[PDB]
Amino acid sequence: AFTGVERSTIGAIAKILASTPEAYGAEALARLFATHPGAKSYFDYADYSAAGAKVQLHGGKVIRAVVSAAEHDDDLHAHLMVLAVTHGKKLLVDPSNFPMLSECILVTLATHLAEFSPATHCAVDKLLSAISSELSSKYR
Amino acid sequence: AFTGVERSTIGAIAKILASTPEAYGAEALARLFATHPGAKSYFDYADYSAAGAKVQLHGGKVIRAVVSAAEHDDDLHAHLMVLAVTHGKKLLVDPSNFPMLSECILVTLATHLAEFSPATHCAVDKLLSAISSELSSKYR
Amino acid sequence: VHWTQEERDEIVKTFFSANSSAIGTKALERMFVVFPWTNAYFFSASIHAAIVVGALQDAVKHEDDVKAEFVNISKAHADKLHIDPGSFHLLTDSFIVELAHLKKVAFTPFVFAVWIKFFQVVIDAISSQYH
Amino acid sequence: VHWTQEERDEIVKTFFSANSSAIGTKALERMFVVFPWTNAYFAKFSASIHAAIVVGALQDAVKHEDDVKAEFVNISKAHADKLHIDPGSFHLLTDSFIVELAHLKKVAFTPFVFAVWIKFFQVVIDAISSQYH
Ligand code: HEM
Ligand code: HEM
Ligand code: HEM
Ligand code: HEM
Numbered sequence: 001a002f003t004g005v006e007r008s009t010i011g012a013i014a015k016i017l018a019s020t021p022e023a024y025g026a027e028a029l030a031r032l033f034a035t036h037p038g039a040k041s042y043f044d045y046a047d048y049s050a051a052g053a054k055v056q057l058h059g060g061k062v063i064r065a066v067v068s069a070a071e072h073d074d075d076l077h078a079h080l081m082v083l084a085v086t087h088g089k090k091l092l093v094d095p096s097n098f099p100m101l102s103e104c105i106l107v108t109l110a111t112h113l114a115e116f117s118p119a120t121h122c123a124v125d126k127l128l129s130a131i132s133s134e135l136s137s138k139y140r
Numbered sequence: 141a142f143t144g145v146e147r148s149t150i151g152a153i154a155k156i157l158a159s160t161p162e163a164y165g166a167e168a169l170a171r172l173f174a175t176h177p178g179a180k181s182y183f184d185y186a187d188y189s190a191a192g193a194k195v196q197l198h199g200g201k202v203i204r205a206v207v208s209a210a211e212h213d214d215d216l217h218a219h220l221m222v223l224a225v226t227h228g229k230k231l232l233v234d235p236s237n238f239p240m241l242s243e244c245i246l247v248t249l250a251t252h253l254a255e256f257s258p259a260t261h262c263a264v265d266k267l268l269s270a271i272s273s274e275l276s277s278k279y280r
Numbered sequence: 281v282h283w284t285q286e287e288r289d290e291i292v293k294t295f296f297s298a299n300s301s302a303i304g305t306k307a308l309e310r311m312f313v314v315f316p317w318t319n320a321y322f323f324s325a326s327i328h329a330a331i332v333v334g335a336l337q338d339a340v341k342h343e344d345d346v347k348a349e350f351v352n353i354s355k356a357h358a359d360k361l362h363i364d365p366g367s368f369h370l371l372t373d374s375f376i377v378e379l380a381h382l383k384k385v386a387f388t389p390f391v392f393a394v395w396i397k398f399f400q401v402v403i404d405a406i407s408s409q410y411h
Numbered sequence: 412v413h414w415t416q417e418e419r420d421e422i423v424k425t426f427f428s429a430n431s432s433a434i435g436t437k438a439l440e441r442m443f444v445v446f447p448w449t450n451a452y453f454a455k456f457s458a459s460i461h462a463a464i465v466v467g468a469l470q471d472a473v474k475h476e477d478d479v480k481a482e483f484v485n486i487s488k489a490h491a492d493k494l495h496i497d498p499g500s501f502h503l504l505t506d507s508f509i510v511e512l513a514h515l516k517k518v519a520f521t522p523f524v525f526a527v528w529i530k531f532f533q534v535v536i537d538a539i540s541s542q543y544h
Pocket of ligand 4: 450453464465466468469489490494500504505536539
């Protein structure tokens with residue numbers, strides 16, 4: 001599913017995320033909570049904005065993991081199994097939430113990156129879709 | 141991830157569906173159109189009920205493909221690739237339609253089958269979700 | 281939200297004739313199996329089914345005003361119980377499957393679309409106080 | 412739908428001064444690359460011309476934030492009854508618009524302002540979906 005041109009583009013995006021995973025993460029989760037408040041139901045937080053300590057914490061973990069998925073483009077099924085088990089069996093997050101978060105990550109990049117062309121967006125969205133798929137795979 | 145009990149139940153449901161594919165498929169489609177009329181957009185039909193001749197024809201094709209998928213539980217990616225290309229690149233079906241149809245096939249089974257336990261329903265839904273996933277795999 | 285008489289009658293007569301408690305108990309057990317993550321929050325299935333079915337009857341009693349009767353139920357789900365609203369339709373879709381089970385050939389695509397519509401109205405009502 | 416003044420102002424000021432046709436043109440173009448199956452309706456052509464149509468309708472919703480449903484009757488019938496647009500694909504357009512508003516507004520596109528635009532677009536999606544039967 002990954003063309004040479006997408007692999008390159010994902011690589012470059014991964015490197016920029018890696019520099020500031022908590023900032024990117026906290027913002028994407030703040031978007032989630034604002035545009036889909038049902039997602040707040042999983043989190044016992046006082047502050048659901050990007051300012052929130054616990055939002056920052058989860059946000060970095062999200063983005064660090066996306067970065068790693070990016071460094072695992074041809075292995076994603078095996079690479080993501082640990083996380084699929086935690087989300088799917090321990091935390092029991094309803095799988096409908098993964099593609100909401102994906103779109104919130106994409107919107108965050110659009111507000112930040114000098115360049116977010118339709119080709120680049122397509123590339124990242126493909127990475128996020130594969131991530132959502134794996135994270136949704138160990139529920140039942 | 142099909143347990144032997146799931147494999148066996150799926151096998152059982154597949155033989156049932158195999159006996160009357162047009163019956164089952166035309167009903168599942170009339171359900172799709174009735175519950176999600178946005179789905180009619182793809183079909184230049186005059187009759188969208190299970191009595192429609194073109195409903196019956198697509199219906200049979202759908203159900204036979206499910207039956208045949210039920211024989212490929214271990215290699216659905218390879219198996220459903222042509223159908224994924226056909227739906228994704230030629231027919232250009234918005235993938236959100238696939239789970240709507242799946243649920244409509246589940247309801248159809250529930251109105252007809254001599255036994256539709258939560259265990260059996262789960263086995264089938266997992267198959268259908270696997271199918272939806274493949275058919276959504278070759279858009280981009 | 282505008283209802284046809286056929287829709288009002290199908291929903292009202294079913295509630296007045298079928299054992300919707302029994303339907304609920306089975307729909308809860310179904311949702312737990314098909315959608316295991318929904319068991320997180322939960323106990324007796326039949327006693328909880330009574331309370332759920334109470335709320336639905338409340339909705340049926342007031343088909344034009346479901347939201348306004350659902351305020352407090354909605355707040356409880358969002359603020360105290362912290363139920364993911366994205367999971368509401370997994371219960372209501374299980375109800376439809378148990379309705380299919382009961383009604384068999386009478387569960388026509390038309391009648392099926394009636395229940396779908398009723399449940400969507402329910403979902404919107406119980407989702408309304410998530411902020 | 413009830414609206415705060417910040418919601419009205421955020422939408423209204425944006426349509427007043429932003430180059431909304433250029434936004435629409437890029438959003439449409441984006442939606443084609445990100446969601447290719449959506450180009451199926453346009454085989455049957457300038458993205459820019461089409462954006463001008465959409466943007467006029469958005470402006471119509473803007474001018475009437477409290478009665479959008481009522482202004483979209485004929486628009487919606489056309490999409491359901493003549494053009495055969497899958498209504499499940501409407502948000503692919505509006506989500507691309509949101510991506511284009513993010514690109515214009517940068518850090519001003521806060522999660523909060525983001526949610527104003529999502530609310531706006533869902534009212535629009537509901538309005539243009541209302542005549543699918
Ligand atoms: C790309 C998607 C996501 C990734 C990569 C991700 C990653 C992670 C990681 C690495 C952890 C710590 C897990 C551990 O300690 O083993 C975690 C915790 C957690 N995740 Fe996610 N997550 C994602 C999406 C979501 C979504 C969409 C939700 C619900 C809407 C969610 C809910 C949670 C919760 C509740 C915790 C526990 C900590 C807390 O309450 O803040 N996750 N996640
Ligand atoms: C389980 C899922 C489905 C299966 C297995 C399936 C299978 C098939 C098959 C075998 C054909 C014959 C086309 C060919 O290969 O020559 C076909 C045609 C077609 N399908 Fe599907 N389909 C499914 C779901 C859907 C959905 C949800 C839609 C749209 C809502 C859809 C839209 C179409 C259209 C527009 C055609 C051809 C037009 C025509 O038949 O006249 N399919 N399908
Ligand atoms: C959409 C249809 C639903 C209706 C009509 C409904 C209705 C209710 C009502 C009326 C109550 C009691 C409120 C009170 O305590 O005053 C309740 C409690 C509860 N609900 Fe729901 N609910 C629905 C969906 C759900 C779903 C999908 C879940 C979980 C996935 C859920 C989880 C719970 C839990 C954990 C309780 C507390 C039960 C106890 O402590 O015994 N509900 N529900
Ligand atoms: C949801 C936001 C949308 C708005 C506000 C909107 C608005 C409009 C309007 C006002 C028209 C002109 C109808 C007329 O008076 O003849 C139109 C036409 C059209 N729309 Fe949409 N539309 C939207 C979404 C979509 C989407 C998602 C598609 C498909 C991807 C689509 C496909 C078309 C086509 C093919 C035409 C006719 C163009 C022509 O042949 O002249 N529209 N739209």
